[PDB]
Structure 1
Amino acid sequence: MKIDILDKGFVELVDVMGNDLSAVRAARVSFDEERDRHLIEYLMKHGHETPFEHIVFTFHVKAPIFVARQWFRHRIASYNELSGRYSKLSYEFYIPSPERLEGYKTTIPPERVTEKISEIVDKAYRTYLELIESGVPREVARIVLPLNLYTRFFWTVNARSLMNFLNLRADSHAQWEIQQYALAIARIFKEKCPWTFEAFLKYAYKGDILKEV
């Protein structure tokens, strides 16, 4: 299962451990859908979230560094990112679409903003390649690359922690770009743990965009 985000990014499921029943089982400490469904809802409305920690996912994410810097602030998880200082960086940058400026009245046409961003990316990237060819080590040359440069990482997180992620990132106050990734994460999560997801939206979700998608 893979979901494309922004112009060249993505979120794909690598592996998963357990399902809704994993939480049920842990809550009873042992080893009827209606009996289980109801327990899941019971645990969710009373704030008993530890049972949901026994469900874990591993995602493979392709995102712009500026989205990554926000994403990595979630410490109750595991990460492994590509090493920019020990591998030639690919020519992958996030170039917003003109619809990204929609709502904002700017001095210049949104499509012009799109153009200026591409320009910087190119000059920056060329300077980079120029630096490497000259013999300047990667760890140094890449420091002139912009924040929209794409990076990839593996993310392992438990269900409780994932729900913490969505409360903060699947919300209109978060930057739009990461919101998009959050929706993708939300969808994959819903697929693997429908019961836990249903209950989350109803009693614990503090966000606002999932209640409308």
Structure 2
Amino acid sequence: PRIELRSDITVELVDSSASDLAVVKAARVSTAGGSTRGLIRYLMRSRHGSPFEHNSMTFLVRAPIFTVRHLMRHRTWSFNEESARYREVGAAFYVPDATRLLRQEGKPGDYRYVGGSTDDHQQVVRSATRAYEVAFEEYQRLLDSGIAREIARLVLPVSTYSVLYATCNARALMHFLSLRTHRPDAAYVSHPQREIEMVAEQMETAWAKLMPVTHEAFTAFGRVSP
């Protein structure tokens, strides 16, 4: 076992200060000392999204670099990621599991995917294994020779696992979920890559425990952020 292949993307809530009541208090500018549902839906209907920002959630995310790229495009979040300049990188790499769709149909612009055969999945695993094993063998060879970490890592693939903290408020999370989940009955159907979708679904599940009224209204109003 020269390297570790994994197919999992992990998201854990580290900390938070978020509830449906926090929205109602901000919207009302509440002083020290069905109505929650009605208020939260009123804000979604009127696109008064600002009260949904007065909260926070922090997630620990472990995902391949190509997926962390998609996550880090959302400029309303805060991130802090482990550095390959700073620390040697572990030989853990992502490959898609047996249920991941492997084939494409239609125009490139459609991001429409379809199932692959059992030999498609085998070919992906064979090809990834060879490429990742060679990449990590050369990375460690360079490190052993005394080459700086920030240069040695040039040979590592975008499937290399990384880990980070990602913090959002609920408004930023709903904008992220609108773009990074593919829901055919949403107001807008987005076509994100499956891997960042896996992140987003786990974030949504965690959020729905903290803010179940807002989570329900968000889907009811077409999964767009107010």
Q: TM-score, length-normalised on structure 2?
A: 0.84
- The aligned residue for residue 37 of structure 1 is 37
Structure 2: which amino acid aligns with 1:147? V
- The aligned residue for residue 175 of structure 1 is 193
Structure 1 CA distance for aligned equivalents of residues 44 and 11 of structure 2: 26
What does the per-residue CA deviation read over 1:131-170, in whole Å, with 9 as the maximum and x for residues that have no partner?
1001111000001100000000001111000000000001
Q: Does the CA contact (< 8 Å) of 1:44 and 1:204 recur in 2?
A: no
CA apart distance, 1:97: 2.0
> What stretches of structure 2 of length at least 5 have no aligned partner?
1-5, 104-113, 183-189
**Correspondence for 2:167 among 143, 151, 156:** 156
CA apart distance, 1:105: 5.1
Q: Percent identity?
A: 41
Structure 1 CA distance for aligned equivalents of residues 116 and 94 of structure 2: 22
Q: Secondary structure at the match of 1:188?
A: helix
- The aligned residue for residue 78 of structure 1 is 78
Structure number with higher helix proportion: 1
Structure 2 CA distance for aligned equivalents of residues 121 and 42 of structure 1: 51
- 2:146 maps to 1:135: yes
> What stretches of structure 1 of length at least 5 have no aligned partner?
1-5, 208-213
Query: How well do the aligned residues superpose, as a CA RMSD in angstroms?
Result: 1.9
Q: TM-score, length-normalised on structure 1?
A: 0.88
**Deviates further, 93-102 or 116-125:** 93-102
Taking the TM superposition and a 5 Å limit, the aligned residue runs for 1:1-213 are 7-31=7-31, 34-100=34-100, 101=102, 103-104=114-115, 109-171=120-182, 173-206=191-224
Structure 2 CA distance for aligned equivalents of residues 8 and 125 of structure 1: 20
Q: Does the CA contact (< 8 Å) of 1:9 and 1:150 recur in 2?
A: no
Q: Does the CA contact (< 8 Å) of 2:77 and 2:172 recur in 1?
A: yes
What does the per-residue CA deviation read over 1:63-86, in whole Å, with 9 as the maximum and x for residues that have no partner?
100001111000001111001111
Q: Does the CA contact (< 8 Å) of 1:45 and 1:204 recur in 2?
A: no
Evaluate the alpha carbon distance shift between residue 96 and residue 105 of structure 1 in structure 2; reply closer, same or farther with a 3 A threshold: closer
Q: Secondary structure at the match of 2:94?
A: coil
Number of matched pairs: 200
